Design an enzyme around this catalytic site. Structure first.
Site, PDB file in Angstrom:
ATOM      1  CG  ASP A 176      -4.083   2.725  13.058  1.00  0.00           C
ATOM      2  OD1 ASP A 176      -4.286   2.811  14.298  1.00  0.00           O
ATOM      3  OD2 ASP A 176      -3.343   1.861  12.548  1.00  0.00           O
TER       4      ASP A 176
ATOM      5  CB  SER B   1      -4.949  -6.746   9.611  1.00  0.00           C
ATOM      6  OG  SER B   1      -4.389  -5.473   9.880  1.00  0.00           O
TER       7      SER B   1
ATOM      8  NE  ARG C   3      -0.879   2.727  14.186  1.00  0.00           N
ATOM      9  CZ  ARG C   3      -0.769   1.577  14.835  1.00  0.00           C
ATOM     10  NH1 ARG C   3      -0.145   1.541  15.999  1.00  0.00           N
ATOM     11  NH2 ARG C   3      -1.292   0.462  14.329  1.00  0.00           N
TER      12      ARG C   3
ATOM     13  CG  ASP D 231      -2.088  -1.006   1.079  1.00  0.00           C
ATOM     14  OD1 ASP D 231      -2.222  -1.656   0.016  1.00  0.00           O
ATOM     15  OD2 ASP D 231      -2.861  -1.145   2.054  1.00  0.00           O
TER      16      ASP D 231
END
Lengths: 389, 389, 389, 389
Positions: A123, A175, A94, A14
Site C-alpha cells: 500500500d 486486517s 489506493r 494509527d
C-alpha cells in the site's frame, strides 16, 4: 518550512495518533484530515469528529463512491483483468485516495502529505507512486517508516500520553479493507495456507451451505462494456453494484481464497469477497465472446495480465495505463447487449445472452484452408523425415 | 495404386458407411478399421464386429486411455491452459487418434488414411494437420468432402442399400464427444446463445439443485505438476481421473456453457463437462501459487494462451509445442505437494495446501525501494508539469 | 565475527583501496582477492601482485574466458536477445563474476563477500542478486555504500595514506568495461545525448572512414545455434570470438550509440563496441529465418525481450531463466548450417546461406484459404454495415 | 447480374489481357480500370491509354501518394513494426489499393471487383481481406485463380488473339513492387538463398562501394512520432520521403536481403530497398528512447510484432488494428524533437538528439531497492538449498 500537512485519515488508532505525532515532529504544523467514502460503510461523521478531536484543524469527508465506480471499477470491468488470474484488485482504491489527498493538498496549499500505510505491504508503494505522479513537488511523510511505534500496544501507550481516544473494541482478528467493490481479509491464522478459511471471516457473503434453495435470475444490460441496467431497471453504477452485491452475496457468490505474490515482500494468503464483481466479470466475458472477433479477443486477453500487474503495483497514473485504456476502449465499442444469469449456491450459471452486434450467425473452402494451414507442418516433416515430436 | 486404406472408425453411421464407400470408390482397395478407447464408454467389441460386418478386412482396437492421460492430459494439466479462458480442450484427443491411425497405417503398408470428420468443423483440420506432421507421404481421404451424401437421411438410405444396420432410434438432440477428460455437447437448440441450456444435456455431471447437502473432502498429492494420489491412495492416471470424475460429477462441478471462436468458421456455442479436469486445474493453480516465483508465474501465465491456441488448432505435433513443453517442464520441477479441497454444490472450495517447496514464509528497505520504483513516474511528472492522466 | 572476506578485485583504484579499508573496518579480518579473466586484456599477474601488495592474504586469478563464452555468450547468441532492441548485454559478465566469487568464498569458508560496484548503477543489483541466488547465507559488504569516500580525488588521498600506488595518469574521459564480448563507454561528455560521439571513444572498432576499401568474406558454420567454424576452420569459442572481433573490428562493424533505461535510475547514454557479436547475431538471425517454422520463429521472437530484460537486470540465476533456456534449446536443435557474410565499411552483407534443415523449397487451395481466413472480417463488416476503420 | 466490373489495373500484360477475359467470361460486362499512383514512377498516361485501348470503358488515375504517406506510412513509422524483425512492410500498399478500388466501385455502381494478384502469393489475401472488410456485398474476381493461362508465353498467345499489345521489352529478371516507401525484388535467381544478391538488382540505392567518401548530415524534426521537417525545412510527407529516399539512397542505405515466412505458402527470399524508411525508423527509435518511460517502451516494443503481423497479413481494416492504433497514438503524444544523423557508406550514424520532453536528466535508496528486488531469489535459494541453476 512545513507549516501545513494533509493526512489521509482512516479513523483508526494509527492515523489518529499520527495527528499529534506530525504536529510534534514538524513544529507548529497544522494537520488537515482527508476522509474518503469508498463504501467502507463506516460512520464517517464519527470519523470526522475524531479527526478534529485528535487535533486536525480541518477534516474533509469526500463522497467518491460514484467516481470510484465510473473512473476505476468501470475501466477494470472493461479490462477483464484479474491479478495472477485470481485477485479482483480491490486495492484499485489506493490511487483514488491519493488523488483526493493531492487535490485537497493543492487547494489548501499544504507543504507535505502524509499517509498511514505500514512499512510492510504494497500500500505504501501504491500511495507514494500515485502522489509522485500527480504532484512530484509535494513532500511525503510516512510515519510508519519513521516512528518508534511497532505494536498496537505501543500505539496505545502513545495514544494515552497524547490525548487520543483508544476505541473500546479491538481491531478485528483479521486486517480488512472494505469498499463497494470488495472486502479483503488477511493476517492472523490466515497467514498459514495449510489452514482452511475460518468460519468467522466472511462479512458480506453467505456461506454456500446457507444460501437459498431456489435460484435467482438476474438480467444485466451492458453498453460499451459496462453495466447500465439490472432486471430492466436503469441504475447508477453505485446502485447497481449495491444491488448486485446484495443479491450475489445472499447466494454465496464470489469468495476467493488465494495466495498471491506481492510486489513488496513475498507471498500473502488472503480471503477476498466481491459478489457483484464476480457476476459482472462473468457477464462481461460472455458478451465479449459474442461481440469481439477472434483476433481482437486474443490480443485483448494477452494484455489483461499487463493491466492487472499495473493496477496491482499502483501504476494507475502513468502513460502506460493511458495507452492500455485507449486500446481497451476501442475493443469495448460494441460490447453492448443483454446477459441473463442464474445465481445459485455459489454458482453464476449462464442463462442466455444477446447483442445487436453479435458475430454469431463450403466443403471445398475447407480443403483449401486445411492444405495451406498445414503446409508448413508438411514441409517440416518432409525435411525431418522420420523425426519425432 | 490404392490397395489399402486405414480408417479412423467410431462405429457410428458415418464411418460405417465410409467402409463400403471407400471400397467402391477405390476398386480392389482393402479397408482397415482403427478403433481407439479414449474413455468414450462404448461397447468396443460391438464396434469392431460392426466394422468387420461392414466390410473392413481388419479392425484394430487399441486401449489408449493411459497413453492419453500420461502423454496428453498430464502436459495439459501442467500447462494450465484454457482456450479463450473458458474451454477445457477435450479435442486434445484428435492428435492421439491421428497418431494411432498413422502408427497402424505404417505397420500395415497402407497407401492412404481416411477419417470421418465433417466438412464444416475444426476436427478435419486437427486430424489432417497431425497426419501431415507425422506422415507427410500418406494420402488423406475425407469422404465428407467428396461424396454425394448430403444429409443424415441420405446416409441412412445409403446404409440400407449397402447392408449397414440402421435401427430406428431418433437423431440425438445434440452432437456429442466423450472421453475420459470431458463430454462436449453442441448443435440443435444449443446453437442459439440466447437460449438457456436445456435440462437434458448433462450426462456425467449432476445439476447443482440435486447435489449432496454434505460437502466431500478430497486430498490430492501432486509430483512435478501432475496428480499421483487421491485421499492418500496412489492411483494410476486413469483410475485417478475416473474416481475424480465420479466424485466431482456427483457434486455438480465443472460445467462450462460457452461461446468460442473456431479456427474454421465463426463462433460455436457448446456445453462442456469435465469434473475431474476442473478439480485438477484448481489444485494445480493453487500449488503453482505456492511454489513458483512471481517472475516464473507471470511468464508461464503469459504463455498459457499460446499453448491453448496450439492445442485448439490441432498443432500438437510441432516443434513450437515441443519448445513450450520444455519450458513448462522446468517450471513444474517443484510443483509438488498436497492440496485439500471441499467439493460442494458445484464449488471447488480450498481447504488447505502445503509443499516442501513452498516459497511462503525492513522499514528502511521499503523507503529505498519505493523511491527507485517510483523514480520514473516522478521524472515524467516533472517534465510534463500540469498534465493529466 | 567476520574473520575472512572475499573481494571481487579488478586492480582499479576503487577495489585496490577496498583491501585496506575492509581490513581496518573489520579488525583481524583477512581479505581474499578474486580476479576473473573475461577478456579485458589486462596484466592479471600484475593485478594479482598488487592485491598481495595491498595486504590480501590470497589472490586468485580465475581464467573464465572459455566458460564465459560457452555458458553465457552462447545462450545469449541462441536467444537473439537485444535489450530494448539495441543493447548487446555485455553486462552478462556480472553473474559470472559473482559465481566465481561465491565458489571461492564457500571454499575458503569466508564470513562475507565484497564487491566494488558504486551506489549508483545497475551493477550493484546484478552482483547482489546473483550472490543471494547462489549463497543466501553470505553477508554482502559494499564499501561504496558505506565509507566516507565521495570522489576519485578522495579515493586517491586514501590510497596514498595506505601504501597503495597511485601514479599520475589523468582521469579517463569515459568509464569503460571490457570483455571478450564488448567494450562499453559511458560518462563524461557522453552523458549529453545531444552531443555526437567524440572521435576518441572507440578502442577496438575502426571508424568507418578508415576501414579497408575491399570487402572481406567470412564463412560461419553453426551447429545447434552456435558458431563452430570460421572460414572452414573449426575454432574454440574464444578463438572464434577473438578472430571475428579482429576482422569485424577492422571493417568498422558493430558500434551502437544508444540511450537505454536502467533498472536503478533513469536513462543512460553509452557507446558499445561488439564487432563479433554483431556478426554472430546477423548470421544467427539468417539461419533461424531458414530453419524455423513461422510459428516457432514468431513465438521465440516474442520471448527475446523477456530474455533481454532478465539478463539486463541481473536475474541470470533464476528458475525463470532456466525455463527460457529449455525453450530456446529446443528451438535451436536444427539451427545448423553455413552463412557467408561480406564485411565492408560498417556493413554486414549477406552473401548466401544454406542448411541441411532448410525449410525453403494449387489455385483452388488459395481460394478456400482466402475465404476462411477472411470470413470473420466479412461477418464483422456485415454486422457493422457501413462502419469505418 | 454482373454488368459492370472495376479492375485494379497495373498496366502490365496480365491485367491488360484480363480486360477482354473479364468481358468474355461475364457476358456484356463493362470494365472500369483503376490506376493508383503510389510512387511507382511509371508513365501513368501510357497506362491509362493502354487500359482504354484494351477495352476498358473508363480508366481512373488517382494520385494517392499523400494519402498513402499520411494514412498508412505515418502509422507504420509510429508503430516501429518490422515483420519478423527484418521486413519493412512495403506491401502496406495493398489495403490502400483495395480501398481506392472499392471507393470508385461504389461511385460507378459496379457489381464486382477484380484484381491481378497471382494464385501463389500473399497479395491475393491482402486484397480480398480488405475488399470483404470494406464492402462484403461486392463480388470478387481473381482471374489468376480461374483462367487457363499459366505462363508468360501463354499470356502472349492470349494477348495476340484478343487485340492486346505485347510490350517489346521483356519483364524484368525479378518480380518487382515499387512505391514511395520501398522497392521489392523477388523471384529468378533470388529464389536460391545460397546465392548472393546479383549486381543488377538495386534500382534506387547505390551499391555501398559506390557511395560518397564524405558523410552527409541530415536533421529530422518529429512531431507526435512523425517527421515534419528535414534540414530545418518543413516538408509535406511526400516531399520529405522523396528527399530522404534520394539522400539515403545515394549513400547506399537501407537494403535488406532476407528470407521471410509467407502467410500463404512457405518461405520467400527477397531484396528490399527502402532508404528513407530506414532513416525514419532509426530516428524514431532514437526519440522513443528519450521520450518514453521504460514501462511504456517495453509494452510498445512487445506489440510491434503483433502490429507487423497484422500489416503483413493484410488485416489493416480490422477492429484489432484500430485498437492497436489507439494504443500507439497515446504513446506518441510526446515523441517530439530533433534527431541529427550522419549518412555514410550504408550506415546511419547518430549525431545527437534532443526533445523538450526528454526524460534524460542516493546510496541508501539503492540498498533498500536491492534487498527487496532480490528478496524472492533469496527465499527461493534458501528453500532449494544446494540446488543448481
Amino acid at each position: 518550512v512545513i507549516k501545513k500537512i494533509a493526512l489521509a485519515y482512516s479513523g483508526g488508532l494509527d492515523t489518529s495518533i499520527m495527528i499529534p505525532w506530525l504536529k510534534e515532529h514538524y513544529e507548529h504544523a497544522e494537520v488537515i484530515a482527508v476522509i474518503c467514502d469508498l463504501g467502507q460503510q463506516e460512520d464517517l461523521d464519527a470519523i470526522k469528529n475524531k479527526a478534529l478531536k485528535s487535533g486536525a484543524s480541518k477534516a474533509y469527508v469526500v463522497d467518491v463512491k460514484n467516481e470510484f465506480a465510473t473512473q476505476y471499477l468501470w475501466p477494470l470491468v472493461k479490462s477483464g483483468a484479474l491479478y495472477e488470474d485470481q485477485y479482483i484488485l480491490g486495492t484499485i482504491s489506493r490511487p483514488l485516495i491519493a488523488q483526493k489527498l493531492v487535490e485537497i493538498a493543492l487547494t489548501e496549499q499544504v507543504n507535505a502529505v502524509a499517509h498511514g500505510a505500514t512499512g510492510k505491504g504494497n500500500d505504501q508503494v501504491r500511495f507514494e507512486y500515485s502522489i509522485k505522479a500527480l504532484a512530484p513537488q509535494l513532500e511525503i511523510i510516512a510515519p510508519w517508516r519513521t516512528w518508534d511505534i511497532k505494536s498496537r500496544q505501543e500505539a496505545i501507550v502513545y495514544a494515552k500520553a497524547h490525548g487520543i481516544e483508544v476505541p473500546v473494541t479491538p481491531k478485528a482478528p483479521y486486517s480488512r479493507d472494505h469498499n463497494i467493490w470488495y472486502i479483503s481479509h488477511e493476517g492472523g491464522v490466515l497467514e498459514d495456507p495449510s489452514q482452511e478459511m475460518p468460519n468467522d471471516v466472511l462479512l458480506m457473503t453467505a456461506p454456500v451451505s446457507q444460501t437459498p434453495d431456489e435460484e435467482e435470475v438476474v438480467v444485466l444490460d451492458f453498453k460499451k462494456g459496462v453495466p447500465v441496467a439490472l432486471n430492466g431497471q436503469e441504475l447508477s453504477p453505485v446502485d447497481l453494484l449495491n444491488s448486485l452485491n446484495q443479491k450475489a452475496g445472499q447466494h454465496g457468490i464470489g469468495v476467493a481464497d488465494i495466495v498471491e505474490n506481492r510486489l513488496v515482500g513475498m507471498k500473502i494468503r488472503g480471503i477476498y469477497e466481491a459478489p457483484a464483481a464476480a457476476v459482472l466479470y462473468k457477464a462481461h466475458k460472455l458478451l465479449e465472446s459474442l461481440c469481439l472477433t477472434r483476433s481482437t479477443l486474443h490480443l485483448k486477453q494477452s494484455l489483461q495480465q499487463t493491466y492487472a500487474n499495473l493496477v496491482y503495483e499502483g501504476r494507475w497514473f502513468s502513460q502506460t495505463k493511458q495507452a492500455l485504456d485507449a486500446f481497451i476502449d476501442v475493443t469495448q465499442q460494441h460490447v453492448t447487449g443483454c446477459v441473463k444469469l442464474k445465481l445459485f449456491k455459489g454458482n453464476i450459471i449462464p442463462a442466455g445472452m444477446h447483442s445487436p452486434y453479435s458475430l454469431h450467425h463450403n466443403q471445398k473452402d475447407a480443403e483449401g484452408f486445411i492444405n495451406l494451414f498445414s503446409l508448413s507442418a508438411k514441409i517440416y516433416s518432409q525435411v525431418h523425415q522420420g523425426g519425432n515430436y
